[PDB]
């Protein structure tokens, strides 16, 4: 522990300045108080303090980027650095994406870097994941990076990802981190780029509405997908509303079906209810899951509702 950092920590320098830290930038960045100090000083620092910090940080980049406290100095630097500094620092993030992407403070640096560097260099990082997609989509940190990349960066540039997902969409949509990346891809790539995702989602609609994660992916397509996708889906639920409504996860999807169904489709769903008596009562009304499905059916009709409030506890 250097003397300058010990004394800083002992509260010897109430008017310490960023220039006093020359040759101590790295060590202060890994310190709880030294970090906040440099983070607070960077906004209003000189071009000379900034270049000095940068140059010192550039020397131990990977280690600060993967550090609990160092990462915030790196990030601060992505905010206030210069274009050429951002980009030099960016080449470090790029060279180490594979580690880092899988690491808690590295998740944060990559995400900060994608929003701080020019566009060539954003693509250049995202494209370092080509060959390595599935492992970080399935990682506790790596999935956040893949979402960020999906968010930043042109859909045209996200093909290699649709491609790694081919043959993998059920395994991904059924994985706590993987689903999430599926749901992101659906929102940022066009309906026609993601057709291979939808192909596998329809193929397995059913195994998927009953999966703890999975049902979530099927709900997202219901609240945001194409009409036609919504309908193949809703149309898949027709004839099973009783059984599906008593499923812990599939009930989530029946609810969404009635909400986002079309007028024409909402009447056929609710109408499947205005039939049957062992099922109207006991089951539909009794069930801790299925009874919210009846409530949603109450929230969306009108002379049809009247026919239907023949339910009563």
Swiss-Prot record:
Stretches the record annotates as Adenine-nucleotide binding in RNA target: 35-39, 107-111, 179-183
In this chain, the stretch annotated as Guanine-nucleotide binding in RNA target covers: 251-255
Enumerate the Pumilio repeat regions by residue range. Answer: 20-55, 56-91, 92-127, 128-163, 164-199, 200-235, 236-271, 275-311
The answer to keyword Electron transport applying to this record is: no
The consequence of residue 36 to A is: Disrupts RNA-binding
* Annotated consequence of substituting residue 144 to A: Disrupts RNA-binding
Which parts of the sequence belong to the PUM-HD domain?
Answer: 2-313
Result, substituting residue 255 to K: Disrupts RNA-binding
One GO MF term attached to the UniProt entry: CCR4-NOT complex binding
UniProtKB keywords:
Cytoplasm, Developmental protein, Phosphoprotein, Repeat, Repressor, RNA-binding, Translation regulation
Instruction: Set out the biological process GO terms recorded for this chain's protein.
Output: anterior/posterior axis specification, embryo; behavioral response to ethanol; cell migration; chemical synaptic transmission; dendrite morphogenesis; germ cell development; germ cell migration; head involution
Q: What is the effect of changing residue 277 to S?
A: Abolishes interaction with brat
Mention any one GO cellular component term assigned to this protein in its UniProt record. neuronal ribonucleoprotein granule
> Where does the record place the region Non-specific-nucleotide binding in RNA target?
143-147
Q: What does this protein do?
A: Sequence-specific RNA-binding protein that acts as a post-transcriptional repressor by binding the 3'-UTR of mRNA targets. Binds to an RNA consensus sequence, the Pumilio Response Element (PRE), 5'-UGUANAUA-3', that is related to the Nanos Response Element (NRE). Mediates post-transcriptional repression of transcripts via different mechanisms: acts via direct recruitment of deadenylase complexes leading to translational inhibition and mRNA degradation. Also mediates deadenylation-independent repression by promoting accessibility of miRNAs.
> Quaternary structure per UniProt?
Interacts with nanos (nos) and brat. Acts via the formation of a quaternary complex composed of pum, nanos, brat and the 3'-UTR mRNA of hb.
- What is said about the domains? The pumilio repeats mediate the association with RNA by packing together to form a right-handed superhelix that approximates a half donut. RNA-binding occurs on the concave side of the surface. Pum is composed of 8 pumilio repeats of 36 residues; each repeat binds a single nucleotide in its RNA target. Residues at positions 12 and 16 of the pumilio repeat bind each RNA base via hydrogen bonding or van der Waals contacts with the Watson-Crick edge, while the amino acid at position 13 makes a stacking interaction.
**Protein name per the record:** Maternal protein pumilio
What is the organism field in this record?
A: Drosophila melanogaster (Fruit fly)
Q: Which residues of the full protein are shown?
A: 1093 to 1404 of 1533
């Amino acid at each position: 522990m250097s003397r300058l950092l010990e004394d800083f920590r002992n509260q010897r320098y109430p008017n310490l300045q960023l220039r006093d830290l020359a040759n101590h930038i790295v060590e202060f960045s890994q310190d709880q108080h030294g970090s906040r100090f440099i983070q607070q000083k960077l906004e209003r620092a000189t071009a000379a303090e900034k270049q000095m910090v940068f140059s010192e940080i550039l020397a131990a980049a990977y280690s600060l980027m993967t550090d609990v406290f160092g990462n915030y100095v790196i990030q601060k630097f992505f905010e206030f650095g210069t274009p050429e500094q951002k980009n030099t620092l960016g080449m470090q993030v790029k060279g180490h994406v594979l580690q880092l992407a899988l690491q808690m403070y590295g998740c944060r640096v990559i995400q900060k870097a994608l929003e701080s560097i020019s566009p060539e260099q954003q693509q250049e990082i995202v494209h370092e994941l080509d060959g390595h997609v599935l492992k970080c989509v399935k990682d506790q940190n790596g999935n956040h990076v893949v979402q960020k990349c999906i968010e930043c960066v042109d859909p045209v540039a996200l093909q290699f990802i649709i491609n790694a997902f081919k043959g993998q969409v059920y395994s991904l949509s059924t994985h706590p981190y993987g689903c999430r990346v599926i749901q992101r891809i659906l929102e940022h790539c066009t309906a026609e780029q993601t057709t291979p995702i939808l192909d596998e989602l329809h193929e397995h609609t059913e195994q998927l509405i009953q999966d703890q994660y999975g049902n979530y992916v099927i709900q997202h397509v219901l609240e945001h997908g194409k009409q036609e996708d919504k309908s193949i889906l809703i149309n898949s639920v027709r004839g099973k509303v009783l059984v599906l409504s008593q499923h812990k996860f599939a009930s989530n999807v029946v609810e969404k079906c009635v909400t986002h169904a079309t007028r024409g489709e909402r009447t056929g769903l609710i109408d499947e209810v205005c039939t049957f008596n062992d099922n109207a009562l006991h089951v539909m009304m009794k069930d801790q899951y299925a009874n919210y499905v009846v409530q949603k059916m109450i929230d969306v009709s009108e002379p049809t509702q009247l026919k239907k409030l023949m339910t009563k506890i």
